[PDB]
């Protein structure tokens, strides 16, 4: 029932610092507010410097910390230190005992302080792996024994997203740009040629496999490269690539005049 809300800027700063530190378990601090007993909100983050050793209690730097605190005060980002991020690259999301002791050093500061583990490397492009939880694969370390998991969500804005949309957008002068033709012709002449050699392949596979089953099939096609996915896949490039180029010209001629 308990949950945290992690603002976008927090999460991106997070993954950035983590992915930058590979593989020395970095650390930093989390700025936010406790709404009720059922919620922690993290709106901000700042990064804690490294040290000859991994993350630990003294890794927290008071001078650095407050030095950042006031600095942010001047900017109106005033908010408690509600938790501390961390990263266990490659080892999934859990607290080592050494993670634990430090987590306690953040218990006696605030009883509701949380631990956030980020895992840079495994964290795929799809669903980013993130974990937040506090004390009392992961079960080896007593996921439920010494500590316990929490839940996470993300505070959003219709704009934030709108910036992010253009992330995988194009340029401006784009759309009217016509790749080098002559060079393109090679794709069709070279691409079609490469397919030609395949055309016979598909023929031989139909005349052959024509008299077999799927178990026998795995012996044939796990070995070599059936020409089926090659003709269909190969046609993909010629089709769309040619249509875009054909279409692009059709517009430049009429439009640009």
């Amino acid at each position: 029932a308990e949950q945290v809300y992690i603002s976008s800027l927090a999460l991106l700063k997070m993954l950035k610092h983590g992915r930058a530190g590979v593989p020395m378990e970095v650390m930093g601090l989390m700025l936010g507010e406790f709404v009720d007993d059922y919620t922690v909100r993290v709106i901000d983050v700042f990064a804690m410097p490294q040290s000859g050793t991994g993350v630990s209690v003294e890794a927290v730097d008071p001078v650095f910390q407050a030095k950042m605190l006031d600095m942010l005060k001047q900017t109106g980002r005033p908010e408690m230190v509600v938790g501390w991020y961390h990263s266990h690259p490659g080892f999934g999301c859990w607290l080592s005992g050494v993670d634990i002791n430090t987590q306690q050093s953040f218990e006696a500061l605030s009883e509701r302080a949380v631990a956030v583990v980020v895992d840079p490397i495994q964290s795929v492009k799809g669903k980013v792996v993130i974990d937040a939880f506090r004390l009392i694969q992961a079960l080896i370390h007593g996921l439920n024994r010494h500590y316990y998991s929490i839940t996470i969500n993300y505070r959003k804005n219709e704009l934030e997203q709108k910036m992010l949309l253009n992330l995988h957008k194009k340029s401006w002068m784009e759309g009217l740009t016509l790749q080098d033709y002559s060079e393109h012709c090679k794709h069709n002449e070279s691409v079609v040629k490469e397919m030609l050699e395949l055309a016979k392949n598909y023929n031989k596979a139909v005349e052959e496999e024509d008299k077999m089953t799927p178990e026998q099939l795995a012996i044939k096609n796990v070995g070599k490269q059936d020409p089926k996915r090659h003709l269909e896949e190969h046609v993909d490039v010629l089709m769309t690539s040619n249509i875009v180029q054909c279409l692009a010209a059709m517009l430049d001629t009429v439009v640009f005049k």
Partner: protein
Amino acid sequence: ALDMTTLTIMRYLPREVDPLVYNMSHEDPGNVSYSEIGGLSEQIRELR
């Protein structure tokens, strides 16, 4: 150098030499010059 969990590069090093190349290298301390011996400036000069 490689990592024990992350298992990535922990820092590239140079080409070691094992604990045997030292004994034959920096260790074996020769003695007096060639004058110490002789009887046949044949090989002494010939080898030199």
